[model samples]
Target: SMPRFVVQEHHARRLHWDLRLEMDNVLKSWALPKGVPEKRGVKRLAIETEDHDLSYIDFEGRIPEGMYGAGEVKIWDSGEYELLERTENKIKFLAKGRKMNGEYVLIKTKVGWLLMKA
Candidate 1:
């Protein structure tokens, strides 16, 4: 079966987004501070986050205040994705979400992981 990917827009102390790719029975998650990157030449910092259960795939709600995070969580994009290549520090994949599509890569660098459209 093909895995899936999802992005969520959330507001905590500041605005940010979460990218989740389903694999190994859970969602491999990443936090993107500036939202999903669309342009091929631009890349954004993607901080590795915790693995979310598959149930989180289509979650949309608002968190109560005074928590680790609190705010309206919106589904930004979602679609089945194909894993192309995955290595220790680099991963390539193809996804066709509503707003994000085609090949993308996440590469680890001295400044952390960078995600970009490829």
Candidate 2:
């Protein structure tokens, strides 16, 4: 089955984007320090994070003071994604969302991944 995905506009310490792909009953997550780029040629740093529960896909609220991710968060985009290819160190997929739609690639790095439109 095609899995659901979400991009959350997070206003944390520095303000960034959270990309979550649903797979294996969890949300495969990443923190885009520079946010997801809308332009074709722009790449963003995606810091891989712990997998979140499926319920988190539609979460939108304040994270409460003094807790982790303590800030405002809202759903930026949410839709289905078609997994094209997946390997030990790379992932290629197609994202369909209200504001984001296209093929994307995530190349793993020592730290996380370089997420970009392809």
Candidate 3:
């Protein structure tokens, strides 16, 4: 229905697009380093991170250095997303972020999955 929009902290090394879809009252997060690539033919690996609470979506602060996610966090994008695919163990969705300015998709995997710019 709605996307829990955020800019994920790539442990301070980099930043990523954090898209969390609400399910069972938890937010399923995906971390995309180098951010969502605009043009087609370019993709980035999506990592399955912790499932944070929906409140985490509005989180905008520092994760203090030496901490797990040490970096400045911001809301990189915010909009609605549609769950395009879903199976017993796989899931997919399309998102539209405010700053991102493009369509994106998230593909589920056995261990993890991928989020790519579309």
TM-score of each: 0.93, 0.93, 0.74
Residue by residue across 1-118, what tens digits does model 1's lDDT show? Answer: 6688899999778889999999879988889998878998688999998898999889999988987669889999999999999987988999979898999999997878989997
Regions more than 4 Å wrong, model 3 = 1-4, 9-11, 101-103, 109-112
lDDT of 2 by residue, 1-118 (tens): 6688999999988899999999878999999988787879788999988999999999999998899889999998989999999997988989998877898888997876889886
Worst 10 residues of 3 by lDDT: 2-11
- Name the runs in model 2 displaced over 4 angstroms: none
lDDT (tens digit, per residue) of candidate 3 on 1-118: 4544555544366756665666558787777765666676576677777899987777777789888878878766666666666774556555665655455666666756766665
lDDT per prediction?
0.89, 0.89, 0.65
Q: Candidate 1: global Cα-lDDT?
A: 0.89
> Looking at candidate 2, what is the lDDT of residue 113?
88
